[PDB]
Write a protein that binds this ligand. Sequence first.
Ligand SMILES: *C(=O)[C@@H]([C@@H]1NC(C(=O)[O-])=C(SC2Cn3cnc[n+]3C2)[C@@H]1C)[C@@H](C)O
Ligand SMILES: [Cl-]
Length: 265
Amino acid sequence: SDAAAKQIKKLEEDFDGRIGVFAIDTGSGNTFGYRSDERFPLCSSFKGFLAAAVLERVQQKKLDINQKVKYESRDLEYHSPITTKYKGSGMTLGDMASAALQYSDNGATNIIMERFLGGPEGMTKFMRSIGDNEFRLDRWALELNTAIPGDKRDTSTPKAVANSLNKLALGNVLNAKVKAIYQNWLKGNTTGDARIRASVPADWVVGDKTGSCGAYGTANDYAVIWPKNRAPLIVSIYTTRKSKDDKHSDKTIAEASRIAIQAID
Ligand SMILES: *C(=O)[C@@H]([C@@H]1NC(C(=O)[O-])=C(SC2Cn3cnc[n+]3C2)[C@@H]1C)[C@@H](C)O
Ligand SMILES: [Cl-]
């Protein structure tokens, strides 16, 4: 079968947009990229890094994983499936951060950015602190999802996402028990079954976080993959289209992931 360079180019032509890819075989250090340094909108995918930042703070004894977070007076954001359920009782910080990741919960994300992580600019400073110079969060969860062509707000690159996921999930930034907790959160993500997970054999373990801006066909997924009997892989796939009414494509993301996994092997 064809080199990845040919398959990814034809896929991108079919998709009528742009596809950005970076994948890492962590057992060799081999990498595959296409548009890997190009900015793409994060959409909700930054929430998986917000969850990791909460766990970094817990490891440092800067937050309590079990502190109760109450929000009985909040007007909860659209797409807050878990915080909606707990509005009367509150949630622990850890459970709220888990929901920000696994359900893309907007209320969980914005409450944690308002109270603990210093807003979009605080989230951005956390990413700088771990050596990610590309990520930028300019707006709040939900608010950020405009995906306008040419707009640099709320972007990163496929490579910086992959490198940051590697750092956060595989033992660089998260050093204590919180590393396994973060891996568990990623593994239980609920929104990615049609994306990178669809490209991976079922007897490999995967954790991921998605994003779907809902405009300009813009959507993404990143994943840590634990194959049987080999070191982890990291896969980061980001997409855009040029007309506001274009829809995103799960099958394009899964395909780009298949191509990337073949390339790094
Ligand atoms: C984040 O990108 C988005 C929210 N997060 C997710 C998600 O990652 O599943 C949903 S996107 C929704 C529309 N769509 C297309 N394919 C899958 N999905 C799920 C919500 C809305 C922003 C708006 O917070
Ligand atoms: Cl969002």
